[PDB]
Design an enzyme around this catalytic site. Structure first.
Site, PDB file in Angstrom:
ATOM      1  CB  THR A 142      -1.008   0.009   1.186  1.00  0.00           C
ATOM      2  OG1 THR A 142      -1.899  -1.110   1.063  1.00  0.00           O
ATOM      3  CG2 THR A 142      -1.842   1.286   1.230  1.00  0.00           C
ATOM      4  CB  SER A 197       2.588  -7.966   1.935  1.00  0.00           C
ATOM      5  OG  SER A 197       1.521  -7.704   2.839  1.00  0.00           O
ATOM      6  CB  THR A 228       0.671  -3.202   6.605  1.00  0.00           C
ATOM      7  OG1 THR A 228      -0.606  -3.180   5.969  1.00  0.00           O
ATOM      8  CG2 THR A 228       1.369  -1.827   6.432  1.00  0.00           C
ATOM      9  CG  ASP A 229      -2.562  -7.106   4.178  1.00  0.00           C
ATOM     10  OD1 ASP A 229      -2.876  -6.181   4.947  1.00  0.00           O
ATOM     11  OD2 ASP A 229      -3.159  -7.315   3.109  1.00  0.00           O
TER      12      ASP A 229
HETATM   13  N1  LIG Z   1      -2.806  -5.453   1.142  1.00  0.00           N
HETATM   14  C1  LIG Z   1      -1.773  -4.448   1.338  1.00  0.00           C
HETATM   15  C2  LIG Z   1      -2.059  -3.750   2.680  1.00  0.00           C
HETATM   16  C3  LIG Z   1      -1.037  -2.703   3.086  1.00  0.00           C
HETATM   17  O1  LIG Z   1       0.105  -2.649   2.556  1.00  0.00           O
HETATM   18  O2  LIG Z   1      -1.377  -1.865   3.966  1.00  0.00           O
HETATM   19  C4  LIG Z   1      -0.431  -5.134   1.400  1.00  0.00           C
HETATM   20  O3  LIG Z   1      -0.156  -5.763   2.441  1.00  0.00           O
HETATM   21  O4  LIG Z   1       0.375  -5.063   0.432  1.00  0.00           O
END
Ligand SMILES: N[C@@H](CC(=O)O)C(=O)O
Ligand SMILES: N[C@@H](CC(=O)O)C(=O)O
Ligand SMILES: N[C@@H](CC(=O)O)C(=O)O
Ligand SMILES: N[C@@H](CC(=O)O)C(=O)O
EC number: 3.5.1.1
Lengths: 315, 315, 315, 315
Positions: free
Chosen positions: B12, B45, B78-79
């Site tokens: 993200t 991720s 973040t995931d």
């Molecule tokens: N789905 C995204 C969520 C994020 O980065 O906040 C990822 O993990 O790439």
């Protein structure tokens, strides 16, 4: 004095190295209520199942319908207490207080937490203000609503929290104060009722996700004739590309797919996944185990995805 | 100025509606370091897998071994950031800072969090005090150790927490302060090294538990030739009687069984389950997804239950 | 068995409706240590003062210097436990464990917390790993460092938290695990020592702030010959224009002014106030009552603002 | 589109290195409401005082009484936002939404939080469900009730929390959901009204407590003709013996004494202090600064201790 029914199911509160045994151990209870105790089961809550849920709910409803009963207290192991509490919140039709309580330390431990927990629980059940608030959970001087409460720690006496909202009241040596009223539908406003339900409930599995995930266990769930599947997705209900393709095929075949999250708090939204394109349901801010309870009940009524999503918005 | 390598993987932080694009968007970075950027991958991720982990780790190690590189910053979704961070903590052999950073709001959002997150991350990587602390995660003005950090909320910018301990330091507009040093083994003290590892890593599945649980998915995991299984048990790693019997048979057959917890915090202890009687491993205070990372690595070395339990006590 | 000195000061742990009475109430203690108990005082910690602090510290140091004593446990009321703990952390010169413990429920309460708290406290004090970690606080199955620990709730048994960092370890029915080491200076590395200190310590008052604040109480503190003043400012140590003018005049006159915060967590930074322009000190992430402890000790050594600010960076 | 009045008072949301400037910076606001902006003041909230509170309240009430105004949004510095929010909750007589909003990062910061905060705040103010919930605070994707909300951290964007209960709803990129309804009296059910109030309000000071406390500042407050005093006591509103004697004499002389707590959460109860014996008031679960707001208003109505205690039970 008001009459309270006490329904015992087992758990660490009755752990050692049932009724009563409890009551006998806390004579001060006799100053606040007349207690009518009975044993519904005697198990660890790790062994809780639908047969016991139905026995417990039927007995609770019968007692609640009795004009001589002012409220019901249920002693229960802490491990699956949040699931039983939410199930009862959706199927019991009464405005009288129903309170679940347990203990994190066994009854023969130094500094065991059960005695004072049970004393407050009974105090909350006899309080006039406890009516019309849905099913309640009383632990560690705190009053929680059944929808919101979760066990967050393996061993702490303060393990229960309401991560998305918060406690609705406090109880300190029997003195009860409410600060908040739950808004989601419960008890008398619920469309679910015991007389319309039969065991077994529709099969619903929960699938966990992680880095390097593959849909093999998801496929095994389908092969085992699951009617719905709750996905404990990463972050905001997310899954790998390969997992998404399997979910799409499942939903097309009529299996109901709910996107929840492994993270523990917050609502799941559409965003990275277009739920409307594939017919998926988002689990609001319910964790995977509470989303499963609601989905099992939904599936006794309908398979219509729009109607099921509305249930997640209302309950 | 110190030279920092920036390895981009996606996420993200690079979401919209890679390098650089970033750096180009934050010119103030040029006042604190010379940045050498490269694209390792460009994925969400949720699609992170072993192939990317190995590519990322190999490249990081090569850069860390270069006397001209002072530290490494990795941008990541973040995931699954907590899983990648723990994997790197166990396989990288360097005392130089390695810092992971992401964003909870996409780069074109009002009030996007990525720019300031990246600015601090670089500030932490150039700080002399950041050495010898293992792999670090910098998010929302806070410095976390890789072992401890977890994503706790679906959408909040403050989603990362260290539920069992806490943050080891703070960073506020580049100003860095440390308060705590991690004690569990990491990086240079780790027995795991890239030169001894090959893809695929041993298969390890995670099984979720709930009221009315049955071991059918557990059996499916065994049938799929899992070498280890992590159980996300209720409360203190607990399972139903029927589940326990299946776990006992599996362990007797040489499958390594780890009891973790779905609750999100606290250590799993023996107590209601005699782990020594059946040869089960307890996952310390690691959540199921981090327990899986350590178990996958353990299984490249040994199948000896005593040795694996010691790893859970040390890492 | 190892010999532990137990120094009792009073508090709810010894509340009812001293030594021993305790020990007599928990015979299992005799299996883990030889206990040498004595009564230092018998007061509620709301009545804690410098005379008792000095008596307590002198006695603790004498016992720590004895080769026959392995560790010291101090029972103390919870209300000012965080202040006593930080004072001892700065003045005791030993690497042996010093552990403070209390109780939130009086000893004759249902589900009283004191017995198990004391049992763990002794278990932590005899553990080899507890050495060299500074003064420790053990409450509710958790091990905290003295600098970090704060009482956060009026009545909960889990009232103690480390809001800026977190717990450094856990203790569960005597089983001790450490995860983190404190980095700020303590005990043997402290420049403060009992032999260089005399009562009374320099007078330091704490002033609270709020909307519509006026410096009248601040002026009263000056008139009462305060040598330093800690301001519990709004947000990031902020004050009204009128308050700032009074602080400026005070600092010019040689009174040492420390900007802390009423909010409860986070570090105070320069920003809206140019501390260097006026000679103010910022209290790092210490709350007002812990900032007062350090300032009182600083003022026995120096009045130099630069040197005092360095102490806030190191301790 | 609905018409919303936006009343600007200053704060970090309008910080740099008023209206509009804001609105001009966020053109997307024009898609959700017609905004009628005005400048009430332009100050840091550390300089908030009664004169501004009255100007703000009078203007808000006038706008709320206008059938053309659907809701009111107030931009405010974060430092004293919890005090202004509670004051307005008690004096405004309308069922229309009143929403306060601020920013923790200045408008020219990387990753400034103000823009998205203001966008949600307006979204909450136009939502039909936001009516009849009392004064609201919207920060960091979260909706709080005015009674409950507190600033807990010096610098974090997620600084606002409701420590005793929790958030009543969520807002994510304008999408609003409520889960809880506040039960304590507010707005239209309040006995306080602007037409019955005059500046200056009765003088009420807040006194902080700590180890080695002495009543000298308390006495200075009395000498300055304080009509009430709020004590930020240790733990459960506790004070030293000497302090208690001074409080007793003050209360006998007709000064109203309220026992609050410095700890930050939980209710203050009678217990170690017999409040009825001395005529003291306990501040429920309000922190010292919010207890002061209610006491100032109470003192315009009555000096009767029984009536004032009832107000703390109802508001
Ligand atoms: N789905 C995204 C969520 C994020 O980065 O906040 C990822 O993990 O790439
Ligand atoms: N395993 C126990 C745990 C507890 O009650 O605390 C149960 O849930 O029955
Ligand atoms: N007032 C008591 C409170 C406690 O010990 O819990 C004390 O600090 O001594
Ligand atoms: N001192 C500023 C802080 C902020 O707005 O965040 C104010 O309250 O106006």
């Amino acid at each position: 004095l008001p009459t309270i029914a006490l329904l015992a199911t087992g758990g660490t509160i009755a752990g050692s190295g049932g009724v009563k045994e409890l009551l006998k151990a806390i004579p001060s209870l006799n100053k606040i209520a007349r207690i009518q105790g009975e044993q519904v089961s005697n198990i660890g809550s790790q062994d809780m199942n639908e047969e016991i849920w139905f026995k417990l709910a039927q007995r609770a409803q019968e007692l609640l319908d009795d004009s001589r009963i002012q409220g019901v207290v249920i002693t229960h192991g802490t491990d699956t207490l949040e699931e039983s509490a939410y199930f009862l919140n959706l199927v019991l039709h009464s405005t009288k207080p129903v309170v679940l309580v347990g203990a994190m330390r066994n009854a023969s431990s130094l500094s065991a937490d059960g005695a004072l927990n049970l004393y407050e629980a009974v105090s909350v059940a006899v309080n006039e203000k406890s009516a019309n608030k849905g099913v309640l959970v009383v632990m560690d001087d705190t009053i929680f609503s059944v929808r919101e409460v979760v066990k967050t720690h393996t061993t702490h006496v303060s393990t229960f929290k309401a991560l998305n909202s918060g406690a609705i009241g406090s109880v300190y040596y029997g003195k009860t104060r409410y600060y908040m009223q739950p808004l989601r539908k419960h008890t008398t406003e619920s469309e679910f009722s015991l007389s319309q339900l039969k065991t077994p409930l529709p099969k619903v599995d929960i699938i966990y996700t992680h880095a390097g995930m593959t849909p093999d266990l998801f496929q095994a769930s389908l092969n085992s004739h699951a009617k719905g599947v709750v996905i404990a997705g990463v972050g905001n209900g997310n899954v790998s590309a390969g997992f998404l393709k399997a979910m799409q095929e499942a939903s097309q075949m009529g299996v109901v797919i709910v996107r929840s999250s492994r993270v523990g708090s917050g609502g799941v939204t559409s965003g990275e996944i277009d739920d409307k394109a594939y017919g998926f349901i988002t689990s609001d801010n319910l964790n995977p185990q509470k989303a499963r309870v609601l989905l099992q009940l939904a599936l006794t009524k309908t398979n219509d995805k729009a109607k099921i999503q509305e249930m997640f918005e209302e309950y």
